[PDB]
Structure 1
Amino acid sequence: SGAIYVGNYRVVNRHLATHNDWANLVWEDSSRDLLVSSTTAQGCDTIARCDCQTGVYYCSSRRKHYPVSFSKPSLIFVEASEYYPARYQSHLMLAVGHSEPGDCGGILRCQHGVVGIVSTGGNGLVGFADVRDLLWLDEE
């Protein structure tokens, strides 16, 4: 689990969104596993605006933050797992690292702020849903 709280937005994995998120929907995209809902209180997370490929992510299944190199946001095949079917996911970045389903929502951060959230895993890779292209999270 986990979310990004920027301005009056809450950013979550689409597959973990709650009824409240859907009842306060701003934007969602199945292809990216992202959903954004509106918040009553202002958040303080800063979204990275950059093309960094190094950062640190939170892995809840190890209670650890790991430094990682990560790839460019791309359209990648995600294999079937115990709880989820095989599908293509867009705006996905991969790193070599540990990820289990319950790690979804863990923050990836660089020196510029939040890059994205854990979204996929398998075969010793961790996949992150990028948010750095969603420039509107910074306004309105």
Structure 2
Amino acid sequence: SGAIYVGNYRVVNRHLATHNDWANLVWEDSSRDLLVSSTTAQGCDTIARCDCQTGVYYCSSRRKHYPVSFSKPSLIFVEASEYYPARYQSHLMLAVGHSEPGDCGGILRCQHGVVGIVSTGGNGLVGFADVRDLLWLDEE
């Protein structure tokens, strides 16, 4: 689990979004495994605006932060999970690293702030849904 809180926005894995997330839907993209919902409280997270390919992610299944190199946001074929059928996910970034189902929502960050959240895993690879292209997250 895990979320990004920036301004009046909550960013979560679409597949972990709650009733309240869907009741306050701002934007969702099934191909990206992202959902954004509105918040009453002002969020403090800074979204990275950059093309960094290195950063640190939180891995709940190891209670550890790992430094990783990751690929640029891409259309990548992702195997069946249970939450999704074996399909293409867009704006996905892979790194060599540990990822289990409950690691989703783990934040990936560089020096410029939040890059994305854990979205996929398996075969010793971790996939991160990019948020750095969502410029609208940093106004109203």
TM range (shorter): over 0.9
Q: Please state how far the C-alpha of 1:81 moved relative to its aligned partner.
A: 3.6
Q: Please state how far the C-alpha of 1:85 moved relative to its aligned partner.
A: 2.5
The 2-side partners of 1:28 and 1:73 are apart by 17
Q: Please state how far the C-alpha of 1:83 moved relative to its aligned partner.
A: 5.6
Identify the residue that residue 13 of structure 1 maps to in structure 2: 13
Identify the residue that residue 4 of structure 1 maps to in structure 2: 4
- DSSP 3-state at the match of 2:31: helix
Change (3 A) 1:24 1:130: same
For structure 1, list consecutive stretches of 5 or more residues without a partner in the other structure. Answer: none
For residues 46-100 of structure 1, give each alpha carbon's deviation from its aligned partner in whole angstroms, at most 9, with x where no partner exists: 0000000000000000000000000000000001246642110000000000000
Identify the residue that residue 96 of structure 2 maps to in structure 1: 96
* Count of aligned pairs: 140
The 2-side partners of 1:137 and 1:81 are apart by 28
TM-score normalized with structure 1 length: 0.98
The 1-side partners of 2:89 and 2:106 are apart by 18
- DSSP 3-state at the match of 1:32: coil
For structure 2, list consecutive stretches of 5 or more residues without a partner in the other structure. Answer: none
Change (3 A) 1:25 1:81: closer
TM-score normalized with structure 2 length: 0.98
Confirm whether residue 67 of structure 1 aligns to residue 67 of structure 2.
Answer: yes
Task: Give RMSD over aligned pairs.
Answer: 0.9
Identity %: 100
Change (3 A) 1:5 1:83: closer
For residues 6-38 of structure 1, give each alpha carbon's deviation from its aligned partner in whole angstroms, at most 9, with x where no partner exists: 000000000000000000010000000000000
- DSSP 3-state at the match of 1:102: helix
Identify the residue that residue 138 of structure 1 maps to in structure 2: 138
For residues 86-137 of structure 1, give each alpha carbon's deviation from its aligned partner in whole angstroms, at most 9, with x where no partner exists: 1100000000000000000000000000000000001100000000000000
- DSSP 3-state at the match of 1:115: strand
Q: Which moved more, 1:128-137 or 1:80-89?
A: 80-89
Q: Which moved more, 1:73-82 or 1:29-38?
A: 73-82
